[PDB]
């Protein structure tokens, strides 16, 4: 239920911030990716609608998971770079 941002890098060329973070999640084997996204978006003042969580990797016996996210400058920039299957997977685009 805690997030610690470990690195924020600005990718000028693709128009996104590249964000690594820890998730502290006592009592869980793994944390809830939607809950993690909400915390991360709040912590860094991101746009939920342009934030792609690439992975949240948990480790057995550890309270600590390791995540990586991409926060796009605009939705357009996200639409240009991210494959459709990923945006649909993570709820950012709604499949017709």
UniProtKB/Swiss-Prot annotation:
- What protein name applies here? Small ribosomal subunit protein eS24
Keyword list (alphabetical) reads:
Ribonucleoprotein, Ribosomal protein
An example Gene Ontology biological process? translation
Please give the subunit comment from the record: Part of the 30S ribosomal subunit.
User: Signal peptide span per the entry?
Assistant: none
- Top-level taxon: Archaea
- Please give the family membership noted in the entry: Belongs to the eukaryotic ribosomal protein eS24 family.
* This protein's encoding gene: rps24e
Q: Which organism is it from?
A: Thermococcus kodakarensis (strain ATCC BAA-918 / JCM 12380 / KOD1) (Pyrococcus kodakaraensis (strain KOD1))
Cellular component annotations (GO), alphabetically ordered: ribonucleoprotein complex; ribosome
Q: Which SUPFAM superfamilies match?
A: Ribosomal proteins S24e, L23 and L15e
Q: Which PROSITE patterns match?
A: RIBOSOMAL_S24E (PS00529)
């Amino acid at each position: 239920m805690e997030i610690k941002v470990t690195e924020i890098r600005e990718n000028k060329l693709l128009g996104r911030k590249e964000i690594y973070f820890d998730v502290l999640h006592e009592g869980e084997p793994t944390p809830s990716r939607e809950a993690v996204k909400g915390k991360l978006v709040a912590m860094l003042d991101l746009d939920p609608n342009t934030t792609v969580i690439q992975y949240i990797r948990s480790y057995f016996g550890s309270n600590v998971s390791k995540g990586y996210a991409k926060a796009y400058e605009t939705r357009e920039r996200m639409l240009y770079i991210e494959p459709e299957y990923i945006l649909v997977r993570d709820g950012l685009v709604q499949k017709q």
